[PDB]
Design a binder for these strands. Structure first.
Ligand code: NA
Ligand code: NA
Length: 317
DNA sequence: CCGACAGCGCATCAGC
DNA sequence: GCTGATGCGCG
DNA sequence: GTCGG
């Protein structure tokens, strides 16, 4: 059902970037994915209506699509110079719905206009403009692996008590990723507790020219650009995030940023039946009254599986 | 019917 | 200068 | 836009 999900995704993107209606966005998105997993060529709006996340208005749009091959509303959207321009601009990192809108109002509409108007771009936006094409590219797995070995080894060289894990679709074993997401921790950093834990690692990664640009950086989160070394033809630049997490919240962190999103959802749901609440930071027990107690000591991803009485599940699954 | 729908780190800005 | 609000990405 | 209380 690629026609229906593409229609929907377009609707989702139009709501997010142009309408600035984040909930309609997520609703269209939820609907698409749900329809992705449906093992039959949808024949009617009503049919899809049965799905969770598919309601009356979408079932109606599905009928119109099936019947006419197109969606009238989507058509008019694409024909509207302002909507399409705003929609395109948001593809630049650091340009969200607010900036895109403001740019199209003053006649700034294209990549070329941005380059002509770099005087009006913040640092994040310039970098986003700069690597516009590379950021939309997928990172094939074998490159992730290469990138991993470098981060882990450079982190190893700074301080070897540093623990680092590359999460995301990658840890679940995907053949490609959109960026690199790295969780870092250290015995000296805890809920209760150093000045430059993240810095030394960010810095050390600049020393060997792996990290090439900085979008943001602070005591706990770094957002930036990296690139693999080449012999021969050069690699695309990639987005990399690095999170510094306290050691007593690291595995909850690892569990969270490993996903999937749908999976986490089921874990939390299950965790409830058993009398535990799980967030990005901690697992805590619930009193009979629904009152969370203190966070429980987690020394591994499995500890969490143990608490909520679940068969430990390997990231791939 | 009507509110909820993730909300957090960092960069930047408005308002003092 | 200082504090809190907002935009953004991420998810 | 869809859900659920
Ligand atoms: Na139904
Ligand atoms: Na973007």
């Amino acid at each position: 059902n690629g026609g229906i999900t593409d229609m929907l995704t377009e609707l989702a993107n139009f709501e997010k970037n142009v309408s600035q209606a984040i909930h309609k966005y997520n609703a269209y998105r939820k609907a698409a994915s749900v329809i992705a997993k449906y093992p039959h060529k949808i024949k009617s709006g009503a049919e899809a209506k049965k799905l969770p996340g598919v309601g009356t208005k979408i079932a109606e749009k599905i009928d119109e699509f099936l019947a006419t091959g197109k969606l009238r509303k989507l058509e008019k959207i694409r024909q509207d110079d302002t909507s399409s321009s705003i929609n395109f601009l948001t593809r630049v990192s650091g340009i969200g719905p607010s900036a895109a809108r403001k740019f199209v109002d003053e006649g700034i509409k294209t990549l070329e206009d941005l380059r002509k108007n770099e005087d009006k771009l913040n640092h994040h936006q310039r970098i986003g403009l700069k690597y516009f094409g590379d950021f939309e590219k997928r990172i094939p797995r074998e490159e992730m692996l290469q990138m991993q070995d470098i981060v882990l080894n450079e982190v190893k060289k700074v301080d070897s008590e540093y623990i680092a894990t590359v999460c995301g679709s990658f840890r679940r074993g995907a053949e490609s990723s959109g960026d690199m997401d790295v969780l870092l921790t250290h015995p000296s950093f805890t809920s209760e507790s150093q000045p430059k834990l993240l810095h030394q690692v960010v810095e050390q990664l600049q020393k060997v020219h792996f990290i090439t640009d900085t979008l943001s950086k602070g005591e706990t989160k770094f957002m930036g650009v990296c690139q693999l070394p080449s012999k021969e033809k050069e690699y695309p630049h990639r987005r990399i995030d690095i999170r510094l997490i306290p050691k007593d919240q690291y595995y909850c962190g690892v569990l969270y940023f490993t996903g999937s999103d749908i999976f986490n959802k089921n874990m939390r749901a299950h965790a409830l039946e058993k009398g535990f609440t799980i967030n990005e930071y901690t697992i805590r027990p619930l009193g009979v009254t629904g009152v969370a107690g203190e966070p429980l000591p987690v020394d591994s991803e499995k500890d969490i599986f143990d608490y909520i009485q679940w068969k430990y599940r390997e990231p791939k699954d």
